[PDB]
Amino acid sequence: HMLEMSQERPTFYRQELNKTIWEVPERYQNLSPVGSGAYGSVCAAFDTKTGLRVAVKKLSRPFQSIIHAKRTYRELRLLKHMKHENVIGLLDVFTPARSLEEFNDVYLVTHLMGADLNNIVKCQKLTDDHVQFLIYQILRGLKYIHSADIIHRDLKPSNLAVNEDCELKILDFGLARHTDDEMTGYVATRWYRAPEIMLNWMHYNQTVDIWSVGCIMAELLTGRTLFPGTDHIDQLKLILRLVGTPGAELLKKISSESARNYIQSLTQMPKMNFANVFIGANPLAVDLLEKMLVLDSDKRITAAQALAHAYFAQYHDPDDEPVADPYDQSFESRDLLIDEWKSLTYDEVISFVPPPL
Ligand SMILES: O=C(NC1CC1)c1ccc(Cl)c(Nc2nncc3c2cnn3-c2c(F)cccc2F)c1
Incomplete structure (x- = not known):
C-alpha cells in the first residue's frame, strides 16, 4: 500500500472569452462558448489528457453572498457524488488560486454533450x-x-x-x-x-x-x-x-x-x-x-x-x-458564514480525485 503525499499543480493559461478572463490548465484546449448563455458561462473544450470533448463551466464570484456560497458548495458536492453513465458527473474541478486567501473562482468540467x-x-x-x-x-x-x-x-x-x-x-x-x-x-x-x-x-x-x-x-x-x-x-x-x-x-x-x-x-x-x-x-x-x-x-x-x-x-x-452510495446532505440544515462555505468549497476542490477513465 503506497500513498500520495502531495498534489502537483498544473500550469495555467489566461484567455478572454465570455467577456471574462478564463484561467485553465494547459490540458484544456480550443475553448469555445456554447449554449448562447442557456447553460451559463460554459465553454466547450478538448481535454488533451483524456481525449474527451468536455464542457467547462466558470462560476465567477461564487461567494458573493451566504446563499451563493452555499449554492456553489451544493453544486460541487452534487457533481462529486455522481458516478453513472446516465448522470452528469465531474471529470475535473479546478481554481487558478494557490491559497484559500486568493480563491474566488470555481471551474467545473463535465462530459460535452451534443x-x-x-x-x-x-x-x-x-x-x-x-x-x-x-x-x-x-x-x-x-x-x-x-x-x-x-x-x-x-x-x-x-x-x-x-x-x-x-x-x-x-x-x-x-x-x-x-x-x-x-x-x-x-x-x-x-x-x-x-x-x-x-x-x-x-x-x-x-x-x-x-x-x-x-x-x-x-x-x-x-x-x-x-x-x-x-x-x-x-x-x-x-x-x-x-x-x-x-x-x-x-x-x-x-x-x-x-x-x-x-x-x-x-x-x-x-x-x-x-x-x-x-x-x-x-x-x-x-x-x-x-x-x-x-x-x-x-x-x-x-x-x-x-x-x-x-x-x-x-x-x-x-x-x-x-x-449509488448515500449522499450526505446534512450541510443543508447547517447555518454558516460566507467564509465557512468558501473554506468548505475550497476543501472539496483540492480533495478531488479524477476518474480512472
Ligand atoms: O448539471 C450540472 N450541475 C448541477 C447538477 C449539479 C452541470 C454543471 C456543470 C457542467 Cl459543465 C454541466 N455540464 C453541462 N452543462 N450545460 C450544458 C452541457 C453540459 C454538458 N454538455 N452540455 C451541452 C452542451 F455543451 C451543448 C449542448 C447541449 C448540452 F447538453 C452540468
Missing part, C-alpha cells in the same frame, strides 16, 4: 425504439440518483442531454431554485412538475421525478406537451381531467388545509382511458404511462420498478443498473 431533448425533438421525429432507449436511460440514471437519496425536483427536456448515438445524461439535479415569476403563466418551466409540488400539497419526495418522466415520455410519443397549462390552476385542471380528481384517501394526505379546500370545490372527474388518449402507441408504453401518471405520489411506479417493465425488455439488464 444537444438537449428539446433540440433533438425539433430535428427528428422519434421512433418508438428511440423513446424506449431514451426513457430507459432517464429511469436508469434516476434509480441511481434516487438511491443516493437525491431528488432532481426539476426534470424537463432542457436538462436531459443527448448525443448522436442517442446516449443520455441527466443534468441539473438537486439544485433548481426558481422564482415565482419564472413559474408564472404559459411556461415550460412548470409543465413537467408534479401537482403536489406545483401547489405545495405536502412535503415532497423523489416520486415527484417520476411524474416528470411521465410527462416527458408522453410528449416524446405524441409530439405534444401533455399539460401545457396557461397558469397553475389551468394546468391542475388539465392534470385532473386526465388522471381524475383525488379520492378520499389522497385528500387526507394533502397536509395543506387551503389546498384541500380548493380541491374539494372541483367537480369530480374519473380517470380517462389512456388507450383512447394515446392512440396508436405501443400498448406497453401506455401501460407504463398509467403507472407513472398516478395522482397519489405513494402509488406511482419507482425508477427501479419501471426498469423491470416489459416496455424496456430489449434494454433491461439487472446486472448493469447500479445504485
